[PDB]
Design a protein around this ligand. Structure first.
Ligand SMILES: [Cl-]
Ligand SMILES: [Cl-]
Ligand SMILES: [Cl-]
Ligand SMILES: [Cl-]
Ligand SMILES: [Cl-]
Ligand SMILES: [Cl-]
Ligand SMILES: [Cl-]
Ligand SMILES: [Mg+2]
Ligand SMILES: [Mg+2]
Ligand SMILES: [Mg+2]
Ligand SMILES: [Mg+2]
Ligand SMILES: [Mg+2]
Ligand SMILES: [Mg+2]
Ligand SMILES: [Mg+2]
Ligand SMILES: [Mg+2]
Ligand SMILES: [Mg+2]
Ligand SMILES: [Mg+2]
Ligand SMILES: [Mg+2]
Ligand SMILES: [Mg+2]
Ligand SMILES: [Mg+2]
Ligand SMILES: [Mg+2]
Ligand SMILES: [Mg+2]
Ligand SMILES: [Mg+2]
Ligand SMILES: [Mg+2]
Ligand SMILES: [Mg+2]
Ligand SMILES: [Mg+2]
Ligand SMILES: [Mg+2]
Ligand SMILES: [Mg+2]
Ligand SMILES: [Mg+2]
Ligand SMILES: [Mg+2]
Ligand SMILES: [Mg+2]
Ligand SMILES: [Mg+2]
Ligand SMILES: [Mg+2]
Ligand SMILES: [Mg+2]
Ligand SMILES: [Mg+2]
Ligand SMILES: [Mg+2]
Ligand SMILES: [Mg+2]
Ligand SMILES: [Mg+2]
Ligand SMILES: [Mg+2]
Ligand SMILES: [Mg+2]
Ligand SMILES: [Mg+2]
Ligand SMILES: [Mg+2]
Ligand SMILES: [Mg+2]
Ligand SMILES: [Mg+2]
Ligand SMILES: [Mg+2]
Ligand SMILES: [Mg+2]
Ligand SMILES: [Mg+2]
Ligand SMILES: [Mg+2]
Ligand SMILES: [Mg+2]
Ligand SMILES: [Mg+2]
Ligand SMILES: [Mg+2]
Ligand SMILES: [Mg+2]
Ligand SMILES: [Mg+2]
Ligand SMILES: [Mg+2]
Ligand SMILES: [Mg+2]
Ligand SMILES: [Mg+2]
Ligand SMILES: [Mg+2]
Ligand SMILES: [Mg+2]
Ligand SMILES: [Mg+2]
Ligand SMILES: [Mg+2]
Ligand SMILES: [Mg+2]
Ligand SMILES: [Mg+2]
Ligand SMILES: [Mg+2]
Lengths: 124, 207, 50, 149
RNA sequence: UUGACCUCAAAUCAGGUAGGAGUACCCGCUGAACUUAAGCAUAUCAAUAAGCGGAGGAAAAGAAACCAACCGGGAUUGCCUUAGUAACGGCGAGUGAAGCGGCAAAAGCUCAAAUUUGAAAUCUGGUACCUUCGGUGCCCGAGUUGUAAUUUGGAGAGGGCAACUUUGGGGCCGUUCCUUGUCUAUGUUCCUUGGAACAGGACGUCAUAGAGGGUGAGAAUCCCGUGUGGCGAGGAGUGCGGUUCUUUGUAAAGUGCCUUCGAAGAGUCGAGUUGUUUGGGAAUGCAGCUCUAAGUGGGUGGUAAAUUCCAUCUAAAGCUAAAUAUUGGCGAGAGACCGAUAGCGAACAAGUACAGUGAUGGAAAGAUGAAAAGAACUUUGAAAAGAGAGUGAAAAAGUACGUGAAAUUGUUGAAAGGGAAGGGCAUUUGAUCAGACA
RNA sequence: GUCGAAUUUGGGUAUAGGGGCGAAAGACUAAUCGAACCAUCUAGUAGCUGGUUCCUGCCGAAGUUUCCCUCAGGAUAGCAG
RNA sequence: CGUGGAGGUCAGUGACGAAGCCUAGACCGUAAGGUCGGGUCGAACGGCCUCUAGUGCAGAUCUUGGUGGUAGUAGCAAAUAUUCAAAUGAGAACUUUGAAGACUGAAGUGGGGAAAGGUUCCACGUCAACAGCAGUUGGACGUGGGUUAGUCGAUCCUAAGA
RNA sequence: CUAUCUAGCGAAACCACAGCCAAGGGAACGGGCUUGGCAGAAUCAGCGGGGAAAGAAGACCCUGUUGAGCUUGACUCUAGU
RNA sequence: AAACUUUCAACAACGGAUCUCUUGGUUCUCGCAUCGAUGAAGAACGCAGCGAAAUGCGAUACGUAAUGUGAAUUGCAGAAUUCCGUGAAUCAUCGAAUCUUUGAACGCACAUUGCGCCCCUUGGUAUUCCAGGGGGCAUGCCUGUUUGAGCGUCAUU
């Protein structure tokens, strides 16, 4: 239960903060959990989603499909996978928007900042 | 708002123009012009008898009469028929009132607190609270009252050495000091027969 | 009239540029509810009143 | 507007009274604020008792002259009889009232006794700055209650 | 002639300062009427609205020319009470305080009036330098028509005598306060339904975390957060908890006894009169005009006056935190409040569109679907479109889009109808239908 | 009807609400005049007109007395629950 | 009896379809009303014990919005007036061209301006709405182009006045 | 030139429900009620008897302890002098 | 007998009630004290690859600098090297700047984008005329500086 006077349980305020969140804050909101192999390897539970990350779909009609993150559409609160698309009647193909909470990260794109974040969260 | 429905310079047209004598908005060129105003029967008007803040909200109750109700509620907790009729699952409870050891006041973890409560026969009452969670049936859902559930056991102690924190997260379970018992908890909804679990120290202190 | 001050002419210039339909590509943006320009003006219907 | 056997009423509501209605919705909130203010002042100021010692005086008027209560401050003669100056007394936590006079020997003796007991039950820390830590008593009035003679 | 002084000017002289906005609350001025009195003029509404001037985070008030009549109390403000009381009032309608008592908060003070007279001891500015919210040296100026020290009535001052007691101004590191950052638990395991599991069933885990929100339907355990703690960053104020650099200073303050003294605010107090105001009534406060004081004096003591006492304060000069107020501004937390004709006029490109010469007046308008997957292609038509096909869980969701009521209307089916129609009781005819087969 | 004048008229300017202007009709002062328009006081008062939202059960009236600037209204007694 | 919201309870109902709506189909109650089946629909809602109110409409020349009969009715008749052919087009009494007949008759239905309007000016494209019939045309709709000063005005002067 | 008929276009007033009479009684002049006369689809152009037709909460008159303009040795005041 | 009129049902119209939904309103409570001549509030006109409005901004114009985060923005186009890095971003923070014409509005005026004066500098064969660039010129009041006025008045020639 809530124990602080600086946090509010008002439903109206919570929804307004979510839909009007700036781009930097939507990055934290768009986090995905790691796989069992990566959870043991690094020692952390979840990370914010990043482009060029290998993911697996674990919910919805696209369950079982894999791919790489080709676009993080923060404005739409969604991500797009390179090989997860829909074919229109005219023959054109459009990406399918997926929520990162319904995905599982199977491979991480690593650089200097990502490694420091992992060590900052107590990972190895 | 005290100004609601009166932010208008509307004035009655009087008789002779084949319309009702209600005040009407002046001017022209907007559609709002000529419409009724200031009336409780008019769209955009003022409600009849607008609500005021100086309505009586709190109610005085005599101090001795208040204690009479509290004593009646405490005595009702010792009657098995009243406790059962209030919806508590005390069918196979050995003895009412139920008194447990004083060491319950020193439990620090939620896991062991639940295990102790289940061991004395409160398992069925705890399961009732979990299975009764429901969505509210009206416009109170988006007024920060979204879910409803039943009331569980009440645990009464003499000294708090961790029991309050250990049971804080358990749904339907509330703790009360023996010295400051609350009628709102002893007879929820003005219904006697709350399931109360007393510690040994609290039971002695009742005298 | 032909004789006009600079202030009037500058005022008329802005009203001419504001009298145009909304670009089509704007309606394709995410979360767009604007369909037609609600502040369109015609010289014979509504007068500027300067 | 007069009918039946009823008392005559004098309800004064012929002005714009609704514009000047004060409802004390913040009664609970102000109590929290006052308790917070007392708590923060006690920590901030000193291990001092948060209040000044007051003398015992006779209430005026024939209706209330049978009781004694707390006055504003000790007189200049009372503090002089206790072996201290008025200027030093104010800095040690003793209220001084220069406009009150002494005409009753019993009241004068009682107030002198209060000053004697106060000086024997306090510790004045030196100005060097050592200031050994001492327990803070929050009420000098409770320590020195006033009793009816 | 020359050089001062006094008064009065000028400069795009050196450096400053005032205006306007906002105005919920605060300090003043000015000032109605509707209304009530069942008419109406005094009265009431009201010392209110409108108008005008001036502030702050609070303002204002404030350390008694007070209250009292007691065994006296002791700055101001606010709450409870006094009290709908004393009193005012065509004594009608109506109006209406204050002392005491309990409580919240508490805090005290300083100028004028004295010869530094063996020393204007005081201060702005300029300039150089410096450890720059300032300091030092120097040079003009202000000022004796009075700038410092010393004393403000509680006192206090000039002399004489005898004694001890008590410190000042900075750095650094902590602590407090505020503004922020980061880290810190537990299933997405099986079966059924479904487009989607966040539903149901089964088996588990965490809990000082079962607040709240998100994610394709009701998610503690999928995501953000929540709970409990840890580790940082940047400022404010000297409030204090420690350490450290300076001896301030033949400095400053306090206390006993004797003696001589003890300055205390003027067109002001007060009085008459006129107007206004107050519960204040032979006159409560305020203001105009006229008169105009005293020093063992002066004010007050709620009935005018003379005379005799008593009580109580010390006006005509000044400053000061907290308890109090707040429909404005900024930042937060909430509700037995409203749910798109409601709630602010405005949930939307709303003080917008539009109207008026102008002051001003002032709307209507929220919902496809989980995702546009917003209908390729074929065919008829000049075209809009239609008929197919297709997308979708659903086109009985097609940008005239959730659900889609009534008035009113089309088609189809049944029935009746010789200047209305509709209704009540009863049964015929047609259509239609439940109940027991025990 | 009048048509060379006490003529007709454009623009500039002056007079503002108990005020203006009037060869005078209480005329005119932005379709508004025996006192303009706008906002506020203001939800002004009304013994007067209109309206006043579900069912069943039991009981069940008065238009008369006295007083009132009382006569379309109240008080008072009566009748009623 | 019914309605919005609140405490308690029925471990109440529900995407295998909650609420709402339609239904000369059924059942209960003297009645206010309650219950069920069928159709439509898509996400919440009810029974009982109590609490609370911005709680029940046929009327107020009621408020706002929507819709009828009247009714394919009144009417679309001032300003003398139109006709033939071709071109264009899906479509021509109304557009374009040619021919004919007419009018304004110089105080004009001609040629320029002041005030006022503000792009209506010109070309190309185009006809859902607007031009109270029509429309291929337009002062309409869409996209572009266009206003050149030492000598013309403003600017300067003063008038009543401010 | 309309009206009239056709193609196109297309309103409003008004509307409790409606629309055949005679007498009767009735709020003392009925489309409805009572007793009789009667009474047959759907309609077009005219017409002004009736619908006490429509247009406006009667300006006349009275009432109200409702106003306003104007007058005067009405009551009470007031600028100026 | 049809047409017509009326009543009911189904389907289709008209219309937008009802139900459910809510980034809004309303009321209560808590904390804080910060506008402007160092040019405010407000107004006008402009600024984007493709923008009318809203929002943001000022010719450095949906932004510049700085700090933080660490890879987007997104309707399309484009740019890509900005991706193990002084670095993506319609991001956050914000202490340095820019800030058109105005406005208490300040050279004088303003129904005018009207008309002067002073200083420095540049060009036109120029201290004087014309033009470009930069910097200035309001009022009341206070303290000081400097230059003065009056037989108001002193002393000395
Ligand atoms: Cl109320
Ligand atoms: Cl539920
Ligand atoms: Cl033009
Ligand atoms: Cl708003
Ligand atoms: Cl207007
Ligand atoms: Cl005026
Ligand atoms: Cl019933
Ligand atoms: Mg309203
Ligand atoms: Mg009691
Ligand atoms: Mg409901
Ligand atoms: Mg046009
Ligand atoms: Mg026009
Ligand atoms: Mg200067
Ligand atoms: Mg005031
Ligand atoms: Mg009256
Ligand atoms: Mg009256
Ligand atoms: Mg009157
Ligand atoms: Mg005012
Ligand atoms: Mg301020
Ligand atoms: Mg305060
Ligand atoms: Mg003050
Ligand atoms: Mg004093
Ligand atoms: Mg006092
Ligand atoms: Mg009064
Ligand atoms: Mg006055
Ligand atoms: Mg007396
Ligand atoms: Mg008197
Ligand atoms: Mg003061
Ligand atoms: Mg609204
Ligand atoms: Mg469906
Ligand atoms: Mg629909
Ligand atoms: Mg219908
Ligand atoms: Mg006349
Ligand atoms: Mg008019
Ligand atoms: Mg009313
Ligand atoms: Mg009876
Ligand atoms: Mg009557
Ligand atoms: Mg259903
Ligand atoms: Mg029906
Ligand atoms: Mg749905
Ligand atoms: Mg109501
Ligand atoms: Mg009804
Ligand atoms: Mg109705
Ligand atoms: Mg009725
Ligand atoms: Mg009506
Ligand atoms: Mg016709
Ligand atoms: Mg005609
Ligand atoms: Mg003609
Ligand atoms: Mg002719
Ligand atoms: Mg001719
Ligand atoms: Mg043209
Ligand atoms: Mg047409
Ligand atoms: Mg057409
Ligand atoms: Mg007849
Ligand atoms: Mg008759
Ligand atoms: Mg009739
Ligand atoms: Mg008849
Ligand atoms: Mg008959
Ligand atoms: Mg007729
Ligand atoms: Mg009438
Ligand atoms: Mg009338
Ligand atoms: Mg009368
Ligand atoms: Mg009158």
């Amino acid at each position: 239960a809530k124990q602080s006077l600086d946090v509010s349980s008002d439903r109206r305020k919570a929804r307004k903060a979510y839909f009007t969140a700036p781009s930097s804050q939507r990055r934290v909101l768009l986090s995905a959990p790691l796989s069992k192999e990566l959870r043991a390897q690094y020692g952390i539970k979840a990370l914010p989603i990043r482009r060029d990350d290998e993911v697996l779909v674990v919910r919805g009609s696209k369950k079982g499909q894999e791919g790489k993150i080709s676009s993080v559409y923060r404005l739409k609160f969604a991500v797009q996978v390179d090989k997860v698309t829909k074919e229109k009647v005219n023959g054109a193909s459009v990406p399918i928007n997926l929520h990162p909470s319904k995905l599982v990260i199977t491979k991480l794109h690593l650089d200097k900042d990502r490694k420091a974040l992992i060590q900052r969260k107590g990972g190895k | 708002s005290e100004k609601a429905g009166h932010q208008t310079s509307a004035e009655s047209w009087g008789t002779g123009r084949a319309v009702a004598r209600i005040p009407r908005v002046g001017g022209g060129g907007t559609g709002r012009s000529g419409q009724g105003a200031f009336g409780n029967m008019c769209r955009g008007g003022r409600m009849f008898a607008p609500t005021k803040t100086w309505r009586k909200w709190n109610v005085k109750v005599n101090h001795n009469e208040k204690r009479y109700a509290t004593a009646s509620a405490i005595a009702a907790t010792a009657v098995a028929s009243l406790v059962l009729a209030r919806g508590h699952r005390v069918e196979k409870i050995p003895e009412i009132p139920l008194v447990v050891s004083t060491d319950l006041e020193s439990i620090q973890k939620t896991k062991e607190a639940v295990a102790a409560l289940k061991a004395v026969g409160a398992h069925s009452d705890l399961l009732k609270v979990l299975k009764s969670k429901k969505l509210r049936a009206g416009k109170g859902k988006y007024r920060n009252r979204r879910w409803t559930q039943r009331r569980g056991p009440l645990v009464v102690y003499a000294e708090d050495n961790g029991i309050v924190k250990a049971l804080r997260n358990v749904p339907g379970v509330e703790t009360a000091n023996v010295a400051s018992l609350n009628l709102l908890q002893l007879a929820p909804g003005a219904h006697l027969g709350r399931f109360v679990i007393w510690t040994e120290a609290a039971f002695t202190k009742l005298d | 009239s032909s004789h006009k001050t600079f202030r009037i002419k500058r005022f008329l210039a802005k009203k001419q540029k504001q009298n145009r339909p909304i670009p089509q590509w704007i309606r394709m943006k995410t979360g767009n509810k604007i369909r037609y320009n609600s502040k369109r003006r015609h010289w014979r219907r509504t007068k500027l009143g300067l | 507007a007069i009918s039946k056997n009823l008392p005559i009423l004098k309800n004064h509501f012929r002005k714009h009274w609704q514009e000047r209605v004060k409802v004390h919705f913040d009664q609970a909130g102000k109590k929290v604020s006052r308790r917070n203010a007392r708590a923060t002042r006690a920590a901030k100021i000193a291990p001092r008792p948060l209040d000044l010692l007051r003398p015992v005086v006779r209430a005026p008027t024939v209706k209330y002259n049978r009781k004694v209560r707390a006055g504003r401050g000790f007189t200049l003669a009372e503090v002089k009889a206790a072996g201290l100056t008025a200027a030093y007394a104010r800095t040690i936590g003793i209220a001084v009232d220069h406009r009150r006079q002494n005409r009753n020997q019993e009241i004068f003796d009682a107030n002198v006794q209060r000053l004697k007991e106060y000086q024997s039950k306090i510790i004045v820390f030196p100005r060097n700055g050592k200031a050994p830590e001492a327990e803070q008593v929050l009420s000098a009035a409770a320590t020195f209650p006033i009793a009816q003679p």
